[PDB]
Design a binder for this molecule. Structure first.
Ligand code: HEM
Ligand code: HEM
Ligand code: HEM
Ligand code: HEM
Ligand SMILES: [Cl-]
Ligand code: NA
Ligand code: NA
Lengths: 145, 141, 141, 145
């Protein structure tokens, strides 16, 4: 979970350009559409029956923003992820019982959403750096297992 | 695994890919090598530097194989048989690596076809890539 | 995915299970609940205590479904359609849990059939349970 | 990666009866047969083309013993798995580049071998305890990723 000096700078420069509203909602929405079993954890969000209802769901957009804000904490605290996600790890293990494999999936979907928004500016080396970040966040979130 | 709606989406989405299948395969390969160095073990004889003639050439074969699969969605085990033998029996590729390339290939489509990479098409190409992966990692011959 | 040798291995292995499919299904469930407590989330309405009659009853149905699958190895999607609807659409079972039950099933077969649970039968039952899991976790309507 | 006092006692009592050579050889052999892609790391062992050749290969039996002896070190240092497998983690992650998923696979195979050797004495509650152990070994071996 270590980046070079140029890697972390490059990662942050792209994060400054992230729309904190759309990206979070789209990533979570794609998770519920592409991995439908995840919908089980969000029965209280309402209609998730078709991509239209999921991608336009106001609760999905709101919760997605929260999720992206937490990924942001990971991008800015790489050297202390295990401590940054202690409470969230406990939440997802004891209370929600989310399998750690799903953290990886949401992490890759987020990467795919970033690629869709930034196009050729999301270079392979820049993605490689975000694969490291996404893996670190996923590992920190599964520490309570 | 693949529904009738999935097949239609896959065929339609791959028509938008068109003649860029080779480019996208090569870029997907390059994203895999940089993003997952573990995958470099299977190409000890390749120049994995950017713009490599080997990677670009290799990507062409992956793009062509996927195009072939798209026209044989109803019989993937039969159409991809020779490639299943190569990857499972001969090369013995860890199945985890097919999930990494599939993610990197979806990442590539998001880059170049952002308006056509809708949630529904996304969901169908992922099912598609998993079915191809299962065939290529199974010893059924 | 399943070779001819796998089909015959599964066929012969399940002939050794015989009338014990329900007992083994029940014991597999008991091993899963204790070994991976998250799986109990899907049975909040069950008596999961030692010797529970509900577990025994459910195990009988799991054993019966596997016996059915063993008799339709060549068309699992069609034979297990009703069971795919329940697990993928209605219950939305995380695919991870199917790997856990499969492992607990094999463990149970290892306990009761130590002389017949050879590496090859082991390998074919693993492929078999993997194909059954794929069908039950997929929306192919 | 913590077990109760009664769990620990039960895990240790069973390991007293584990023949590290027979269980190790069978466990490694089944890994190569049931997950054929693992054979790629052992090409220098010779013919692994069929289960007969795998299960009778002397290099498979020898290495299996080594592997099971290392599980034993984990079974006797449950409170220090990371430090116990630190060197082996570097070997498998930075030098061999073995995907962590295969660590979990070998641990489940070991459990199946234990179940086959000890029969009804390998109770569900005893298996539950060893599932924790193999998961602990698997995570410790992947900590270098
Ligand atoms: C890197 C991955 C993830 C991050 C950073 C993350 C972050 C969060 C955050 C910030 C919250 C809000 C907690 C609060 O408001 O107190 C939350 C809650 C929650 N998470 Fe996630 N999460 C992740 C993955 C997942 C996944 C994969 C699932 C299910 C498939 C999931 C299911 C839930 C649920 C059900 C809640 C509670 C929702 C509610 O009660 O409104 N999380 N998570
Ligand atoms: C959708 C997934 C994949 C497709 C469609 C695909 C397709 C192909 C094709 C068409 C060939 C050449 C066949 C021939 O020349 O007869 C090939 C070779 C090869 N593949 Fe893949 N492949 C896939 C995944 C992978 C993965 C995940 C790896 C390893 C991480 C891999 C490693 C290799 C290697 C090492 C070769 C031989 C290279 C050489 O001959 O120089 N493949 N593949
Ligand atoms: C090979 C794998 C599996 C098979 C063959 C199987 C088989 C079945 C069958 C035959 C039923 C019918 C229940 C009835 O008619 O009363 C059922 C229902 C059910 N299955 Fe499974 N199952 C499998 C895996 C799983 C897994 C892994 C889970 C969760 C961890 C699960 C959770 C359930 C639940 C909660 C029900 C409903 C029980 C009830 O409401 O009484 N199944 N399954
Ligand atoms: C999951 C628990 C595992 C444990 C506890 C373990 C332990 C060990 C041990 C003790 C050695 C000997 C090192 C030495 O002699 O200096 C070793 C080497 C090795 N391991 Fe493992 N291992 C595990 C899994 C795996 C897996 C899953 C693979 C590949 C799929 C693997 C591949 C290798 C290889 C190739 C070597 C070197 C063989 C040689 O000396 O020629 N190991 N490991
Ligand atoms: Cl055998
Ligand atoms: Na992906
Ligand atoms: Na197994």
């Amino acid at each position: 979970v270590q980046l070079s000096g140029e890697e972390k700078a490059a990662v942050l420069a792209l994060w400054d350009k992230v729309n904190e509203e759309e990206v979070g909602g789209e990533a979570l929405g794609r998770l519920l559409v592409v991995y439908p079993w995840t919908q089980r954890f969000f029965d209280s969000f309402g209609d998730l029956s078709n991509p239209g209802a999921v991608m336009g769901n106001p609760k999905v957009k709101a919760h997605g923003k929260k999720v992206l804000h937490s990924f942001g904490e990971g991008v800015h605290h790489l050297d202390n992820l295990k401590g940054t996600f202690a409470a969230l790890s406990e939440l997802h293990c004891d209370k929600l019982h989310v399998d750690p494999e799903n953290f990886r999936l949401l992490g890759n979907v987020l990467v795919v959403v970033l690629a869709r928004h930034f196009g050729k500016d999301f270079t392979p080396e820049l993605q490689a750096s975000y694969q490291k970040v996404v893996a670190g966040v996923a590992n920190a979130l599964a520490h309570k297992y | 695994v693949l529904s009738a709606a999935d097949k239609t989406n896959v065929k339609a989405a791959w028509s938008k890919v068109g003649g860029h299948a080779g480019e996208y395969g090569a870029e997907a390969l390059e994203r895999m090598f940089l993003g997952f160095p573990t995958t470099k073990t299977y190409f000890p004889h390749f120049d994995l530097s950017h713009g490599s003639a080997q990677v670009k050439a290799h990507g062409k074969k992956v793009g062509d194989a996927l195009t072939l699969a798209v026209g044989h969605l109803d019989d993937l085990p039969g159409a991809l048989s020779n490639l299943s033998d190569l990857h499972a029996h001969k090369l013995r590729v860890d199945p985890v690596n097919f999930k990494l390339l599939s993610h990197c290939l979806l990442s590539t489509l998001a880059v170049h076809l952002p308006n056509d990479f809708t949630p529904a098409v996304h969901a169908s190409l992922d099912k598609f890539l998993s079915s191809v992966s299962t065939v290529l990692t199974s010893k059924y011959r």
